[PDB]
Amino acid sequence: ILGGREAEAHARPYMASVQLNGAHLCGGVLVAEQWVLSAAHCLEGKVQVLLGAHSLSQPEPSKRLYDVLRAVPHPDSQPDTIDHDLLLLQLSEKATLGPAVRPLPWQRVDRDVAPGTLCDVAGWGIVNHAGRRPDSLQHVLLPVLDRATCNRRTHHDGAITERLMCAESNRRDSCKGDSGGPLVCGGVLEGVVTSGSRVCGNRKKPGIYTRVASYAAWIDSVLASAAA
Numbered sequence: 608i609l610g611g612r613e614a615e616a617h618a619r620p621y622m623a624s625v626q627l628n629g630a631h632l633c634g635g636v637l638v639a640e641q642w643v644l645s646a647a648h649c650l651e652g653k654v655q656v657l658l659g660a661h662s663l664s665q666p667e668p669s670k671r672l673y674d675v676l677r678a679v680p681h682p683d684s685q686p687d688t689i690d691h692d693l694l695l696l697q698l699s700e701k702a703t704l705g706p707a708v709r710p711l712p713w714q715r716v717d718r719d720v721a722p723g724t725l726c727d728v729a730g731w732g733i734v735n736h737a738g739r740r741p742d743s744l745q746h747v748l749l750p751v752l753d754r755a756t757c758n759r760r761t762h763h764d765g766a767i768t769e770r771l772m773c774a775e776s777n778r779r780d781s782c783k784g785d786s787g788g789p790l791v792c793g794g795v796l797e798g799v800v801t802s803g804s805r806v807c808g809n810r811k812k813p814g815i816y817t818r819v820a821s822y823a824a825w826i827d828s829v830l831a832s833a834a835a
């Protein structure tokens with residue numbers, strides 16, 4: 608997260624660190640007891656999910672590391688597009704829920720968030736252009752950018768479909784290692800960070816977030832199959 612501030616420890620109990628070979632790779636969102644939503648591109652080694660965390664390194668009573676039983680990318684995702692960039696991770700077991708570990712309700716009403724609304728995006732991604740990595744979770748409030756603006760040639764040139772939303776990227780933004788994490792509006796998950804342009808913090812290249820409401824059937828069906 609660029610231009611943000613330290614999160615309150617454990618105040619966003621859905622926040623997950625998706626880890627590869629023991630190192631923070633991408634954010635994720637706990638969406639049910641045994642499932643974390645993240646971004647497919649992140650998994651383009653040993654994948655694990657750290658729940659209950661604030662600091663990546665320091666001892667905390669709620670911190671618990673989970674192995675991943677199955678990684679389920681969206682079936683229409685592809686390495687060369689930004690579309691359908693969602694990933695469902697099934698934990699080795701049901702997470703131990705508590706004040707610090709709780710799923711986040713996600714939006715099922717398929718309607719755009721009003722442009723200009725500030726939504727909250729959190730992560731352990733880089734915090735400056737030098738690539739410095741934070742030990743503790745950061746977050747930032749970003750304004751939703753209207754799709755008609757975001758699709759202009761100078762910005763994302765038509766790539767913002769109805770299943771995507773944009774937020775302003777003027778200095779404040781999501782960045783490397785934030786993909787997969789949440790864009791939360793009014794307390795409900797609206798977006799999942801995707802990497803868009805690799806450029807962060809440049810107003811000319813807004814942040815892109817996958818709209819969860821567009822993917823309700825997929826999430827419901829993956830979870831229902833596993834529950835059979």
Ligand SMILES: NCc1cccc(-c2cccc(C(=O)N[C@H]3CCCc4ccccc43)c2)c1
Nearest residue numbers: 736781782783786801802803804805806807814
């Ligand atoms: N849209 C934003 C965003 C959101 C999620 C993931 C990323 C993302 C994912 C993978 C790598 C990179 C990357 O290395 N960016 C570098 C180089 C370009 C210019 C630039 C400017 C500022 C800071 C970093 C960088 C970024 C970017």
